[PDB]
Structures are given as structure tokens and as C-alpha cells.
């Protein structure tokens, strides 16, 4: 599996307005992001279109499709901040 795919969106090391805003949409894992529709996520009254570049980068560089259903992504310990 990918080391950053199983990481929290808040700790993915991206831009300023991206990682922090993602964890505010009940997304504390990249696994949810890869199955999230950008057309709706980037339309949220907070998310910026400039964040799409970084978000799409993670999926593209990992070979993940838009809304690609993952077989297993949430482990034993999964909490929020």
C-alpha cells in the first residue's frame, strides 16, 4: 500500500489551504478523498479551486481514479483532531 494514502489529509504536506480544509469536511484519511467527488468537494463554501491541483496530484501520482472505491482503507485506530 502507499505510505501517504493511509495518512491523514491534515498531515499530507501540501499547500496552506488544502490539507487543513480537507480535515474540516469529515475527511481525516486520504482514503475518503480518493472516493470523494471533486466537483462537490471543491464546491464546498470554503474549499478553494487552487487546492484541486494538489488533490488531483495525489490521486494521479498514486494511480487512483475519481471516486475510486477502495476495498480497505480504515484501520483499527481512526480518530479525528
Amino acid at each position: 500500500f502507499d505510505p501517504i494514502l493511509l495518512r491523514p489529509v491534515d498531515d499530507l504536506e501540501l499547500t496552506v489551504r488544502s490539507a487543513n480544509c480537507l480535515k474540516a469536511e469529515a475527511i481525516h484519511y486520504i482514503g475518503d478523498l480518493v472516493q470523494r467527488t471533486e466537483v462537490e468537494l471543491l464546491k464546498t463554501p470554503n474549499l478553494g479551486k487552487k487546492s484541486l491541483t494538489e488533490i488531483k496530484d495525489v490521486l494521479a501520482s498514486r494511480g487512483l481514479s475519481l471516486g475510486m472505491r477502495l476495498e480497505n482503507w480504515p484501520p483499527a485506530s481512526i480518530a479525528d483532531e
Binding site: 499547500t15 496552506v16 480544509c21 478553494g48 487552487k50 483532531e81
Partner: protein, 129 residues
Amino acid sequence: MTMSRRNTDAITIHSILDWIEDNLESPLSLEKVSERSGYSKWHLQRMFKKETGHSLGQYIRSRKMTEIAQKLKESNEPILYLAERYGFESQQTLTRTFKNYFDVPPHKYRMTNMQGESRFLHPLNHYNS
């Protein structure tokens, strides 16, 4: 309840600081621009002020000022360019803002070696800066 980490009134504002920082390099991104990233100017200002401690429009200028100052010392990017790039209508405008903030002219600040991190607001806006 039972968290002792973040506040509900905080999380709604804990997604504005980062928004501004990643949108102040070129656009203005004031309360009216952040309206689509939160609530109406008059309401967002109140919420922002009661969370960060500083005013929104005040913060925008403060952060942009120090950001330009750094690019005047570390970088050699033209003042006119920095102005137009940061959203200023003219270099004269930037010169006015800079002088009324750092008290030192943008061009002089670039040559002042004694000048350092003074009045430099950081992208935190929660603990004095």
C-alpha cells in the same frame, strides 16, 4: 462534548487562516472574497475577530506587508511587480501601505541590512502574531 482539544466556534474559523495564506500571493482575498469560504463579511469579521483576536481586513494587509517585505530583502523582485502581483493597483499604492506599516520605504527596506523581522505578522494570527 468530551474533547478538550478544539472548539465548535474555533473549527468554523480554523479554515480561514490557511485559505487567506494560500490566496494572498496574488488575489486580494478580503472578507468579501472569503464570503464564499464562510459567511457574510459583517458576520465573518465578528467570528474571525472572536477567534483569532485580530480583524480580517487588518490581518490581510498585515500578512501581505511582511510577505512583500521578505521578497524585498531576500528576493530582488521589482517593487512595481510585487505591487501588481500582490493585487495593488500601483507601485505608489504599495509604497503608501508599506510606509504606513513598516515606516520604511519599500526600496529602502530592500537596502536596509539593519532592518529585520519587525512588525512581521505570521500565518498564525492567534498568539500576538
